[PDB]
């Protein structure tokens, strides 16, 4: 459009459409539903790279949960 | 069924101007879609109700300032719907780029828009609201009942059913056959969500027909409950039996044997399941020739 | 006044304007203030134009607000409102203790850059007692001739433009020759001027 | 020191 | 091209003097989220928010004034619209009450906020009901030069002009037109005119044509006139209840006329006539020779 | 069209003077105003618009509308 | 070139007839090129018919007043040269005008032969007192624009011949101005408003649509200097810009019996526009064909209306 | 003209109403009603100059009693 | 009532000149169609001209290249009278080099295939023992006065200057109408059109193409019935 500028992938992420309480499930939540969303997302690399970068152990990001970012952070 | 809750719903007076703007987004997301010509962009919005149309197209005009069209062409094609679909032509980038159907300078938004989503729990009351215009269902599987609400696309869904939290409501999105849709199966819940929308009438009505109806102890369980609902099937084959008298005031148009026959065993043994109604002709047939003979008898008193 | 078309197409009345922006690195009690582009909040767009000192590239375009020279000064420990370290918080954002006093193009101003001359009072310069650096720049911008502009003969008949028409809309000779100014003849006889 | 309001017959219009 | 109640404004100034209100105006029609990108939106200069702005413009007042203000014609409230440039634009006729010339002079602009104060510059100030001057009484807007000019050489006789016809009978003003375009009658001459059944016939002209047994109207009487072709274009631009004036319009004229119209009429057919005469005797201004 | 309507002269019909006509259309705007501004919150004594608007029009127009057409009244307190 | 902007012409109607036409948005300029012209145009280019001369009697040239009647000379002529006539024959055509005794004497009194008529029998031409007598003669011909009686002036003398002016454009009065009119785009765009006013027999669209002809033939005969210049290029013609929507479509048909579209499908037609033109031959040499599948590629066919045996538009599929 | 209204607001709430430039900025921005005028600070800087001169300026209310002005 | 409908001819004066007599019209009636045609020819016959150019040792317009005697504002000037035609409606690119003592001409510049300069006689420089010059220049297609700063791309480069463009071939266009009186008992005009051209087409193609814009803007008029 005529916007001309780019803040940056936070404006293109996916699940600002969506239920934000359903990427932070509670007392025995599911995660298939916000795993899904992600999926579809294409900044799904950079929330990935940015969740790795600050290194946060809440919540779920670029597809993953909390221990998948643990596990990839193992290496 | 559903026309006069959603009649009810339409005719209710809106104030808050964010609660008009979320409306006004939610429609136009759920029964709209954007026709791309000349390289630029029409809106067009296809409503099945009676005087929603005015209504979205009052509000596009009002809190946006733009002027529509309300071509009064059926959606389904046939000219039977006889239901209303609203374009707007010149300006209608600059309604799509400021109601949240497209930005970013990119695609359109496969979910509701940004904006909808984290307000005020009014907001989400309204996106509720336009929502259940634009596509809708009030059944009764049973004595109990489920709202439904097919929704453009699993975002879409789970945003309804994240909105719906917010009210306090339970929802539960759902998919079939790659169609999906948002439910709420508790009955309760389903009067306390219809009043948040605004309709009481309609409230009061579904409220004392499922009280009503709904306590007729069964003993639950299978073989108890299953055959509660084997004779709920037989009630519908009863609401199947209205269609027949339907048929009946419509004469039926001299029917040949095979179908008269079906209706009468069916009309006669009113209880009977179709595999029984089947057992009883004279050459035994099986279910698959009575539900057949059901489904013609039906489309031939579709007039 | 009325002119044509033509006196702004072939720069007939069109006239090149500098200006000069000054700014300097002193000395303060919490430390020396430094010019670089290493500034501690602005999104990278900006610091695309300046150099490896902090200063705008010569032949750079700038427009109202843009960044000409990039300073920054220490402000020292400072409490921040409960929303304003709420917000950090959120964000993560580490405050630098130094702010930004950059110089920038007033409002209402372009042009190119026309030339940078920087004084180092570590290079030698006779800078004055408490300036460590001086820098100055040119930036310089070509006018036309536009309405509002004002015009004037010999013989003290002035005026301002209020149009400027095409040439095809101009009164024009038998040979099709347009005028390029018309003037109104009421100012003649009463100002008693008939030297015009 | 005045005191505007609509008259009632203008009311009931709308 | 303005009308008497209207000024031209920069679109800079325009949008440095009106920022609060399209900031607020473009948050509401969700081209922006909140006041801070508005704000920014605003600043950056984008193409959207002088849309937004030509509409939070409408019908809002401005005082324009021009210093030293010696009385109280000196400040008046116009109508703003934009311009592409960065010089005000001023009604040719309110710069008599301003002493306004067109040789460098600036004048400023202030912005009515609250509701009383618009009601006060809307009501009170308003440019085109403050035709005639305190001191005395006069009108002060009023055509001045360039104007009694053109509908001087309009309204004139014949005296050493090239008078071609002088004798000539027409059904209406039309065909006088039509004559006069092909070079067959000059603007002065002194021709048989026909007018309809509207006009109001010359103050005075106390004979119509003598009669038996059928009297005339002051109105309605279908009344041939001895007079030129410019004194019928001057008289189709006063309003229609107006008698034919049917004598040569100086300064001195012009302004018995605007007097009279101010003293008899409404306000606001005293602003269009004013505007109508402003026109035609800039344009047979520049036909004069 | 636009500030010089509706004209002074039918408007002073209707009241006594320039500036009690200034202090009515005032008063009539800042209801219509605040009318406008809380028109979402609970209700309060707030009335009006009494005639057909635009899309976003000055409230002071509105005002000036309604007295022409005659659909206020002034007393004294 | 691309204009990007075609301009387009909308009429208003102010009386019976008279018309106020608006052009927009003409490029910058453009709002005078084509004013003046078409004014002059609407007020000489028009052809029309009128009255000449008269003859009122055996006896005239005593200005004062002609006897029997009670108005003058000149009323007479004026009232004479208001009427509105209609001819057909190249050659001046005479009529004759024998109304007697006291009362009015009106256009309807007229005896016009056969090839010419007047269009307004209700305007009144004089009134007879005393049981006058007013046996006038009127010779009627065909012009251009305004001419006067001067250029009819006879050489030869008569009598009783009095030349009058004749007003043969059926306008009678044009006028025209320019505003801005561009706010999205830059302004500067003209929009041309012209007020059209003409008489009883032709209405303003009639004199509009003539002057444009005439124009357009006036601006060719240019233009034929040489055919392949390059112009400022209008683009989208209405009437093809809009009729693409429904004539060459790929689609051959979206709702229809779908025995007779499976059927043709498969014999050498893909877009209607295929269909359209030489139908009735197509259909009837090759294999397919049928006798009542006419009705459902004939008269359902027409999707906003249509014929067969059509020229179709996009002769090249955009493949 | 007789305009009081706009005098005031010129006067006040556009110079010195120190209090009255963020409240009437907020109430443009948030779109409400334009909140009446206070006291200009010249008045309040020319009072205490007055009372640095030994001179004892005070402003009365109805009844005999001073103000005070914060 | 005549019968007789206006005819063309042309006459040439001079390669670039050309007299257009229009004849017989109806009587007041040149003076209105000469002067749309001269309006037409001065405002919207297209052309095409350079829009921006790019030099080798050169930033900014405000500076000097060494060894020539003009400033860059000067060449600039110089290359704004160049009449060039194009034939590509994209933004072609033609190659400028000289080095060595001697006055670089119109005539030096290197144009593509499509692309032409019609006065290889205009001086653009003049160069002494020391200074070379390498530069590009831009041409596009278009019509009337296009300012340097319409001419500015997004994003442009460091090198890149932008430059008024003027694309228009006519250079004079007057008219003038003659009272025929010719004896046909009546009165008629006789219009006269006297337009010359800048060397880049005949006048011929600009009064056709004058012709062509005029008829396509009054048949939206013609079609009104
Ligand atoms: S990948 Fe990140 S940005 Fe994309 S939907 Fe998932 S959480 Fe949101
Ligand atoms: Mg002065
Ligand atoms: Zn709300």
């Given at each position: 459009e005529?916007?001309?500028?780019?803040?940056g992938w936070?404006?293109?992420a996916?699940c600002?459409?969506?239920?934000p309480?359903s990427?932070?499930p509670?007392?025995?939540?599911?995660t298939?539903?916000?795993?899904?969303?992600?999926?579809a997302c294409?900044v799904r690399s950079?929330?990935?790279?940015?969740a790795?970068?600050?290194?946060?152990?809440?919540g779920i990001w670029?597809?993953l949960?909390?221990?998948e970012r643990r596990?990839?952070?193992?290496? | 069924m559903?026309?006069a809750?959603?009649?009810?719903?339409?005719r209710?007076?809106?104030?808050?101007?964010c609660?008009?703007?979320?409306e006004?987004?939610?429609?136009?997301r759920?029964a709209?879609?954007?026709?791309?010509?000349?390289?630029?962009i029409?809106?067009?919005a296809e409503?099945?109700?009676?005087?929603?149309?005015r209504?979205?197209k009052?509000?596009?005009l009002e809190?946006?300032?733009?002027?529509s069209?309300?071509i009064?062409m059926?959606?389904?094609?046939l000219?039977?719907?006889?239901r209303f679909?609203?374009?707007?032509?010149?300006?209608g980038?600059?309604?799509?780029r400021?109601?949240?159907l497209?930005?970013?300078?990119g695609?359109?938004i496969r979910?509701?828009?940004?904006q909808?989503?984290?307000?005020?729990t009014?907001d989400?009351?309204?996106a509720w609201?336009?929502?259940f215009?634009?596509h809708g269902?009030?059944?009764?599987?049973?004595?109990?009942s489920?709202?439904?609400?097919?929704?453009?696309?699993?975002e879409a869904?789970?945003?309804?059913?994240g909105?719906?939290?917010?009210?306090?409501?339970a929802?539960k999105?759902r998919?079939?056959?790659?169609?999906?849709?948002?439910v709420?199966?508790?009955?309760d819940?389903?009067?306390?969500?219809?009043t948040?929308?605004?309709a009481?009438?309609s409230?009061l009505?579904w409220?004392?027909?499922?009280?009503?109806?709904?306590?007729?102890?069964?003993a639950?369980?299978?073989?108890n409950?299953?055959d509660a609902?084997?004779?709920?099937?037989?009630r519908?084959?009863?609401?199947?039996?209205?269609?027949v008298?339907?048929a009946l005031?419509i004469?039926?148009?001299?029917?040949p044997?095979?179908?008269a026959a079906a209706g009468?065993?069916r009309?006669?043994?009113?209880?009977?399941?179709?595999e029984?109604?089947?057992?009883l002709?004279?050459?035994?047939?099986?279910?698959?020739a009575?539900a057949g003979?059901?489904?013609?008898?039906?489309?031939?008193?579709?007039k | 006044?009325?002119l044509?078309?033509?006196?702004v197409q072939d720069?007939?009345?069109?006239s090149?304007?500098?200006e000069?922006?000054?700014?300097?690195?002193?000395?303060?009690?919490?430390?020396?203030e430094?010019?670089?582009?290493?500034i501690?909040?602005?999104s990278?767009?900006?610091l695309?134009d300046?150099?490896?000192?902090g200063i705008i590239?010569i032949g750079?375009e700038?427009?109202?607000?843009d960044?000409?020279?990039?300073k920054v000064?220490?402000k020292?420990?400072t409490?921040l409102?409960?929303?304003?370290?709420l917000?950090?918080?959120?964000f993560?954002e580490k405050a630098?203790?130094?702010?930004?006093?950059?110089l920038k193009?007033?409002?209402?101003?372009?042009?190119?850059i026309?030339?940078?001359?920087v004084?180092?009072?570590?290079?030698?310069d006779?800078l004055?007692?408490?300036?460590?650096?001086?820098?100055?720049?040119?930036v310089?911008?070509?006018?036309?001739?536009?309405?509002?502009?004002?015009?004037?003969?010999?013989?003290?008949?002035?005026?301002?433009?209020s149009?400027?028409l095409?040439?095809?809309?101009?009164?024009?000779l038998?040979?099709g020759?347009?005028?390029?100014?018309?003037?109104?003849?009421?100012?003649?006889?009463?100002?008693?001027?008939?030297?015009? | 020191?005045?005191r505007?309001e609509?008259?009632?017959?203008?009311?009931?219009?709308? | 091209?303005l009308?008497?109640?209207?000024?031209?404004?920069?679109?800079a100034?325009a949008?440095?003097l009106?920022?609060?209100?399209?900031?607020?105006?473009?948050?509401d029609?969700?081209?922006?989220?909140?006041?801070?990108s508005?704000?920014?939106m605003?600043?950056?200069?984008?193409?959207?928010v002088?849309?937004?702005?030509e509409?939070?413009?409408a019908?809002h007042?401005?005082?324009?004034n021009?210093?030293?203000?010696?009385?109280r014609?000196?400040?008046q409230?116009?109508?703003?619209?934009?311009?592409?440039?960065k010089?005000?634009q001023?009604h040719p006729?309110?710069?008599?009450?301003f002493?306004?010339?067109?040789?460098?002079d600036?004048?400023?602009?202030?912005?009515?906020?609250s509701?009383?104060?618009?009601?006060?510059?809307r009501?009170?100030?308003?440019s085109?009901?403050?035709?005639?001057?305190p001191?005395?009484?006069?009108?002060?807007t009023?055509?001045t030069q360039?104007?009694?000019?053109?509908?001087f050489f309009?309204?004139?006789?014949?005296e050493?002009?090239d008078?071609?016809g002088?004798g000539?009978?027409?059904?209406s003003?039309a065909?006088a037109?039509m004559?006069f375009?092909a070079?067959?009658?000059?603007?002065?001459?002194?021709?048989?005119?026909?007018?309809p059944?509207g006009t109001?016939?010359?103050?005075?002209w106390?004979?119509?044509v003598?009669?038996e047994?059928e009297?005339?109207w002051?109105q309605?009487?279908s009344?041939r006139?001895?007079?030129?072709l410019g004194?019928?274009l001057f008289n189709?631009?006063?309003?229609?209840?107006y008698?034919?004036?049917?004598?040569?319009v100086?300064?001195?004229?012009?302004?018995?006329?605007v007097?009279?119209?101010?003293?008899?009429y409404?306000?606001?057919?005293?602003?269009?006539t004013?505007?109508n005469?402003?026109?035609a005797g800039?344009?047979?201004?520049?036909?004069?020779? | 069209?636009?500030i010089?309507?509706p004209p002074?002269?039918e408007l002073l019909?209707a009241?006594?003077?320039?500036?009690?006509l200034?202090?009515?259309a005032?008063?009539?705007?800042?209801?219509?105003?605040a009318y406008?501004?809380?028109?979402?919150?609970?209700?309060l004594?707030?009335?009006?618009?009494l005639?057909?608007?635009?899309?976003?029009?000055k409230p002071?127009?509105?005002?000036?509308?309604?007295?022409?057409?005659?659909?206020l009244?002034?007393?004294?307190? | 070139?691309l204009?990007?902007?075609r301009?387009s012409?909308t009429?208003?109607v102010?009386?019976?007839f008279?018309?106020?036409?608006?052009?927009?948005?003409?490029?910058?300029?453009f709002?005078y090129?084509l004013?003046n012209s078409l004014?002059?145009?609407?007020?000489?280019?028009?052809?029309?018919?009128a009255?000449?001369s008269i003859?009122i009697?055996?006896?005239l040239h005593?200005?004062?007043?002609?006897?029997?009647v009670?108005?003058?000379?000149?009323?007479?002529?004026?009232?004479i040269?208001?009427?509105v006539?209609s001819?057909?024959?190249?050659?001046?055509?005479?009529?004759?005008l024998?109304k007697?005794?006291?009362?009015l004497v009106?256009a309807?009194?007229?005896?016009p032969?056969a090839?010419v008529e007047?269009?307004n029998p209700?305007l009144?031409?004089?009134?007879?007192?005393?049981?006058?007598?007013?046996?006038?003669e009127?010779?009627?011909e065909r012009?251009?624009?305004?001419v006067?009686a001067?250029?009819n002036?006879?050489?030869?003398?008569?009598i009783?011949?009095?030349?009058?002016?004749?007003?043969?454009?059926?306008?009678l009065k044009?006028?025209?101005?320019v505003?801005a009119?561009?706010?999205?785009?830059?302004?500067?765009?003209?929009?041309?408003?012209?007020?059209?006013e003409?008489?009883?027999?032709?209405?303003?669209?009639?004199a509009?649509?003539?002057?444009?002809?005439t124009?357009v033939?006036l601006?060719?005969?240019?233009r034929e200097?040489?055919?392949d210049?390059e112009?400022?290029?209008?683009?989208?013609?209405?009437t093809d810009?809009?009729?693409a929507?429904?004539?060459?479509?790929?689609?051959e048909e979206?709702?229809?019996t779908?025995?007779?579209?499976?059927c043709?499908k498969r014999?050498?037609?893909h877009?209607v526009?295929?269909?359209?033109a030489r139908?009735?031959?197509?259909l009837?040499?090759?294999?397919?064909?049928?006798?009542?599948?006419?009705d459902?590629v004939?008269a359902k066919?027409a999707?906003?209306?249509?014929?067969?045996?059509?020229?179709?538009p996009?002769?090249?599929?955009?493949? | 003209?007789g305009?009081?209204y706009?005098?005031?607001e010129?006067?006040?709430i556009?110079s010195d109403?120190?209090?009255?430039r963020?409240?009437?900025?907020?109430?443009?921005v948030?779109?409400?009603?334009?909140?009446?005028?206070g006291?200009?600070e010249?008045f309040?800087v020319?009072?205490?100059?007055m009372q640095?001169?030994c001179?004892?300026?005070?402003?009365?209310?109805?009844?005999?009693?001073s103000?005070?002005?914060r």
């Open positions: 005529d916007a001309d500028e780019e803040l936070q404006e293109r996916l600002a459409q969506t239920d309480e990427f932070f509670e007392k025995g939540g599911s298939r539903e916000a795993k899904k969303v992600c999926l294409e950079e929330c990935l790279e940015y790795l970068q600050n290194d946060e152990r809440f670029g597809g949960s909390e221990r596990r990839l952070k193992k290496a | 559903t026309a809750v959603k009649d009810e719903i339409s209710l007076p809106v104030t808050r101007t609660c008009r703007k979320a006004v987004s939610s429609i136009l759920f709209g879609g954007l026709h791309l010509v000349s390289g630029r029409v809106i067009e409503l099945d109700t009676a005087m929603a149309a209504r979205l009052r509000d596009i809190i946006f300032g733009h002027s069209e309300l009064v059926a959606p389904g094609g000219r039977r719907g006889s679909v609203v374009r707007v032509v010149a300006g980038d600059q309604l799509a400021q109601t949240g497209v930005d970013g300078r695609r359109p979910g509701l828009p940004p909808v989503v984290s307000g005020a009014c989400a009351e309204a609201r336009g929502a215009l634009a269902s009030l059944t009764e599987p049973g004595r109990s489920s709202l439904e609400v097919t929704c453009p696309g699993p869904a789970l945003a309804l059913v909105a719906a939290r917010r009210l306090s409501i929802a999105a998919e079939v056959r790659g169609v999906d849709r948002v709420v199966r508790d009955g819940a389903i009067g306390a969500l219809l948040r929308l605004g009481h009438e409230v009505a409220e004392e027909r499922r009280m009503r109806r709904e306590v007729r102890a069964t639950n369980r299978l073989a409950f299953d609902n084997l004779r709920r099937s037989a519908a084959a009863v609401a199947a039996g209205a269609r008298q339907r005031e004469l039926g148009e001299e029917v044997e095979h179908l009468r065993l009309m006669e043994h009113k209880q009977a399941s179709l029984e109604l089947g057992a002709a004279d050459p035994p047939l099986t279910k698959d009575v003979r059901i489904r013609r008898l039906l489309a031939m008193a579709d | 006044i009325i044509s078309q033509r006196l720069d007939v009345l069109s090149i304007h500098i000069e922006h000054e700014v300097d690195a002193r000395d303060t009690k919490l430390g020396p430094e010019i670089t582009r290493d501690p909040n602005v990278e767009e900006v695309a300046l150099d490896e000192r590239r750079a700038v427009v109202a607000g960044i000409l020279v990039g000064t220490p020292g420990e409490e409102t409960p929303e304003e370290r917000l950090r918080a959120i993560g630098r203790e130094v702010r930004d006093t950059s193009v007033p409002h209402g101003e372009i042009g190119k026309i030339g940078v001359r004084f180092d009072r570590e290079e030698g006779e004055p007692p408490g300036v460590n650096q001086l820098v100055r720049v040119y310089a911008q070509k006018r036309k001739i536009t309405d509002g502009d004002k015009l004037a003969g010999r013989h003290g008949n002035k005026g301002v433009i149009k400027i095409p040439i095809e809309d101009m009164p024009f038998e040979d020759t347009p005028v390029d100014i018309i003037l109104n003849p009421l100012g003649v006889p009463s100002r008693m001027n008939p030297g015009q | 020191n005045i505007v609509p008259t009632e017959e203008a009311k009931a219009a709308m | 091209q009308k008497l109640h209207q000024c031209g404004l920069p679109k100034m949008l440095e009106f920022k609060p209100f399209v900031m607020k105006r473009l948050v029609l969700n081209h922006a989220q909140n006041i801070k508005a704000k920014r605003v600043e950056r200069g984008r193409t959207v002088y849309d937004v702005l509409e939070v413009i019908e007042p401005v005082l324009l021009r210093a030293p203000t010696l009385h014609l000196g400040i409230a116009f109508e703003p619209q934009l311009v592409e440039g010089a005000i001023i006729l309110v710069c008599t009450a002493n306004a010339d067109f040789d460098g600036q004048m400023a602009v202030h912005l009515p906020l509701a009383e104060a618009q009601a006060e510059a009501i009170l100030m308003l085109s009901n403050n035709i005639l001057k001191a005395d009484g006069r009108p002060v009023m055509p360039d104007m009694v000019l053109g509908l309009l309204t004139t006789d014949g050493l002009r008078t071609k002088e000539r009978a027409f059904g003003t065909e037109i004559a375009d070079g067959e009658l000059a603007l002065q001459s002194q021709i048989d005119i026909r007018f059944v109001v016939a010359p103050r005075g106390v004979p119509p003598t009669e047994g009297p005339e002051q309605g009487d009344f006139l001895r007079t030129s004194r019928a189709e631009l006063l309003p229609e209840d008698p034919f004036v049917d004598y040569s100086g300064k001195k004229q012009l302004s018995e006329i007097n009279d119209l101010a003293e008899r409404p306000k606001v057919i005293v602003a269009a004013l505007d005469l402003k026109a800039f344009y047979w201004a520049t036909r004069s020779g | 069209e636009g010089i309507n002074i002269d019909e009241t006594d003077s320039k500036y009690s200034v202090i009515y005032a008063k009539r705007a800042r209801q219509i105003n406008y501004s809380q028109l979402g919150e609970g209700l004594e707030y009335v009006g618009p005639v057909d608007t635009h899309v976003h029009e002071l127009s509105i005002a000036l509308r309604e007295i022409n057409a005659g659909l009244t002034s007393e004294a307190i | 070139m204009i990007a902007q301009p012409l009429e208003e102010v009386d019976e008279r018309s106020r036409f608006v052009i927009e948005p003409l490029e910058p300029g709002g090129t004013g004014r002059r145009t609407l007020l000489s280019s028009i052809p029309g018919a009255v000449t003859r009697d055996g006896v005593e200005f004062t007043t002609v006897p029997g009670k108005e003058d000379v000149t009323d007479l002529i004026l009232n040269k208001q009427l006539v001819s057909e024959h190249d050659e001046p055509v005479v009529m004759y024998r007697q005794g006291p009362g009106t309807a009194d007229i005896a032969p090839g007047v269009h209700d009144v031409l004089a009134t007879l007192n005393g049981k006058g007598k007013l046996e006038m009127l010779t009627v012009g251009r624009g305004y006067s001067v250029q002036k006879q050489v030869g003398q008569e009783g011949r009095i030349p009058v002016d004749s007003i043969y454009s059926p306008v044009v006028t025209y101005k505003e009119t561009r706010v999205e785009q830059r302004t500067d765009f003209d929009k041309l408003i012209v007020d059209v003409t008489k009883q027999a032709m209405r303003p669209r009639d509009m649509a003539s002057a444009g002809k124009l033939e601006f060719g005969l240019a200097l040489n055919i210049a112009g400022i290029d209008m683009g989208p013609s209405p810009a809009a009729l929507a429904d004539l060459a479509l790929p689609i979206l709702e229809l779908v025995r007779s579209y499976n043709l014999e050498g037609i877009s526009g295929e269909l359209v139908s009735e031959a197509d009837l040499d090759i294999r397919n064909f049928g006798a009542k599948s006419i459902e004939k066919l999707g906003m209306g249509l014929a067969l045996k059509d020229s179709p996009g002769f090249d599929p955009t493949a | 003209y305009a009081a706009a005098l005031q010129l006067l006040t556009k109403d120190v209090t009255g963020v409240k009437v900025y907020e109430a443009i948030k779109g409400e009603n334009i909140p009446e005028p006291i200009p010249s309040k020319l009072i205490k100059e640095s001169l001179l004892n300026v005070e402003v009365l209310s109805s009844d005999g009693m103000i005070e002005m």
